[PDB]
């Protein structure tokens, strides 16, 4: 072929430097190979020459070959097995970084032929005296399991990992519990006098990552009695103030599980400050922190009942925590602090984020329906937002005041005159569907309702069918309240819904309204104009599943883990 040549170019300049005897040029040659792998260059012809640089004693040189062997340990595994006879030489030399380098690299090779070459040098590494080696020999056992090795010999290895839990260096117990958690998907003898007492003495000593895997393992623990469940929670609660976003939610994951219980009222005052100070972190951490508050304030509402001020939305927050601090603000809105929410939700409706103002105005409507003594405040906010005359606010407040007229009939009718002055600014198909209802109902009071629906009727087509059905229902409600003056509309729209329209969902509503009014208008008042019933959370079977998965990604989607 062309452009390979095996004699000059980039490769033969490197094969002259990989075979250079002085190790000053060897290290600079392997670094150029590793940077040539990431771009995508064929360096597979360099492979039996890089491995000749392993016969060395310089530490910086062997780590550079191992990165060349690491990228080929996973991408092209049938080549990395060519170097296995120098791996097991490096599982016996001193400078026990190299002990931990060879065991890490042989764990990544997904060939079944390493198992007679790895099962023996794991057993010297799991009893090594420098505990950096046991930190990666314990994770290699979880790497040996993912290699297709059922391996009752590795069931002789799990006898060593359970011994590694009762070790002296807690960076070993960081991985030994992390491996025994992940290999438990295929175990974890949770002995009450010995294992749990040694896990918790590890917990106050580990890294800020091993205190995640231990608490993610105690989330699979079940107490014997409720006397034990107190003496476990008195040692997890010191892990509610650590400088990591992760440790706290794993220490909430244990406490929200171990409330199968006086102390039950004591613990809720200790679970509330760190779940509040979980939001002083970076923006992606809050999105996990807020969607685990969003389960806790559904499951146990009495924890964060008094802390709504922290959940207010700042201007510079990203949109995934502006839409989520808004949602938790709704679930904590009560009779006492609705004065602080509605004066805050009015503040977000004068912003510029269109899809956030469109949800901040609706959150006023989810406060009026939720908190029933506050609808006068929720209406007086909405009639002030329409005085700002902003056409993405008025076209959203007119949909919410429809949902306040339905929940609360014949108390707030007097602001319909304040609404309909902004009739010309209605453009959205949802906002116009709300006005035609508001003229449709209460047409016994709006005197010129016979003309307001007719101005919508000239452009009856080229509209959404949400409007076209609602205008069909509103003129018929206008007919059955005033069967003397708007009869000339009912010949119009009902020969626009049936004779002209091609949508059968619009058309069948036309003939059903047409055959009512030509049969019996006394019955038709009982059908169309009957008094409508009033209008109005994770389902608790699914909710009690997710509190077992507080810190994890199952709670972030509010989905059970079988959908992953």
């Amino acid at each position: 072929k062309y452009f390979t040549t095996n004699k000059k170019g980039e490769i033969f300049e490197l094969k002259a430097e990989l075979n250079n005897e002085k190790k000053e040029k060897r290290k600079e040659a392997v670094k150029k190979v590793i940077a040539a792998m990431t771009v995508g260059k064929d360096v597979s012809s360099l492979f039996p020459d890089v491995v000749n640089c392993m016969q060395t004693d310089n530490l910086e040189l062997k780590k550079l070959v191992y990165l060349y062997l690491m990228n080929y340990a996973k991408s092209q595994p049938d080549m990395a097995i060519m170097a296995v006879n120098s791996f097991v030489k490096d599982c016996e030399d001193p400078n026990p970084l190299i002990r931990a380098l060879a065991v890490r690299t042989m764990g990544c090779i997904r060939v079944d032929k390493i198992t007679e070459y790895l099962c023996e040098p794991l057993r010297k590494c799991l009893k090594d005296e420098d505990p950096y080696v046991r930190k990666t020999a314990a994770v290699c056992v979880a790497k040996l399991h993912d290699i297709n090795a059922q391996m009752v010999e590795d069931q002789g290895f799990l006898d060593s990992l359970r011994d590694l839990i009762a070790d002296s260096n807690p960076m070993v117990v960081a991985n030994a519990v992390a491996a025994l958690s992940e290999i438990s998907e295929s175990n974890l003898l949770d002995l009450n006098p010995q294992n749990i007492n040694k896990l918790l003495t590890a917990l106050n000593e580990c890294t800020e990552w091993g205190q995640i895997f231990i608490l993610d393992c105690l989330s699979n623990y079940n107490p014997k009695d409720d006397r034990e469940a107190q003496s476990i929670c008195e040692r997890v609660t010191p892990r509610l103030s650590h400088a990591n976003s992760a440790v706290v939610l794993s220490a909430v994951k244990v406490l929200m599980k171990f409330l199968e219980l006086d102390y039950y009222n004591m613990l809720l005052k200790k679970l509330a400050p760190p779940l509040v100070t979980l939001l002083s972190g970076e923006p992606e951490v809050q999105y996990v922190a807020l969607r685990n508050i969003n389960l806790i304030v559904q499951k146990r509402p009495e924890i964060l009942k008094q802390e709504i001020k922290v959940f207010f939305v700042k201007y510079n927050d990203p949109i995934y925590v502006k839409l989520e601090k808004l949602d938790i603000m709704i679930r904590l809105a009560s009779q006492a602090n609705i004065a602080q929410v509605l004066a805050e939700l009015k503040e977000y409706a004068t912003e510029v984020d269109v899809d956030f103002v469109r949800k901040a105005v609706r959150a006023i409507g989810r406060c009026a329906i939720k908190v029933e003594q506050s609808a006068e405040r929720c209406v007086s906010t909405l009639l002030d937002l329409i005085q700002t005359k902003v056409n993405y606010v008025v076209q959203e407040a007119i949909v919410v005041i429809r949902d306040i007229f339905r929940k609360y009939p014949n108390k707030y009718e007097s602001i319909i005159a304040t609404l309909c002055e902004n009739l010309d600014s209605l453009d959205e198909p949802d906002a116009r569907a709300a006005m035609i209802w508001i003229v449709g109902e209460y047409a016994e009071r709006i005197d010129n309702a016979d003309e307001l629906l007719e101005s919508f009727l000239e452009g009856f087509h080229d509209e959404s069918t949400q409007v076209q059905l609602t205008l069909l229902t509103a003129i018929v409600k206008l007919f059955l309240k005033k069967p003397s003056e708007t009869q000339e509309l009912v010949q119009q729209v009902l020969s626009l819904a049936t004779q002209d329209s091609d949508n059968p969902d619009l058309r069948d509503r036309g003939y059903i309204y047409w055959r009512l009014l030509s049969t019996d208008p006394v019955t038709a008042k009982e059908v169309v104009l009957s008094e409508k019933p009033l209008i109005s959370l994770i389902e608790p079977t699914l909710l009690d599943e997710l509190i077992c998965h507080i810190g994890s990604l199952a709670s972030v989607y509010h989905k059970p883990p079988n959908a992953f």
């Binding site: 002083s280 201007y315 510079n316 004065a339 602080q340 004066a343």
Partner: protein
């Protein structure tokens, strides 16, 4: 006690005196470090602290943001004049980026937006 905003890279310049920016030294700060804005109820504190250890250098109660405790320099939108309490004393802050002096002004606005607002619900 809450934390309104907290930022590194502020600079304290001594004040030869109004309060124009160029009448200072402007070349080498007499102090540098991290800014902390704390809130003990109604009394807002600015906290000048070291960026490594957390050693509190100087601290000033505000209580009035258009008041004389925080006075923006008439020249520029980033340099300030603060009344430190120990004893009343005038040292001059000065911030690096405009966004670090905008988010200072907003954080001392929104706290006194809240203090006046709770004075309204107290009357209700």
């Amino acid at each position: 006690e809450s934390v309104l905003c907290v930022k590194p890279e502020v600079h304290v310049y001594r004040i030869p005196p109004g309060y124009r920016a160029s009448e200072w030294q402007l070349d080498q700060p007499s102090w540098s470090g991290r800014l902390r804005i704390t809130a003990k109820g109604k009394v807002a504190y600015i906290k000048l602290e070291d960026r490594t250890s957390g050693e509190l250098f100087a601290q000033a109660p505000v209580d009035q943001f258009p008041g004389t405790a925080v006075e923006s320099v008439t020249d520029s939108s980033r340099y300030f004049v603060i009344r430190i309490e120990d004893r009343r004393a005038f040292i001059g802050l000065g911030f690096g980026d405009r966004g670090d002096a905008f988010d200072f002004n907003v954080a001392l606005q929104d706290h006194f937006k809240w203090v006046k607002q709770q004075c309204e619900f107290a009357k209700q």
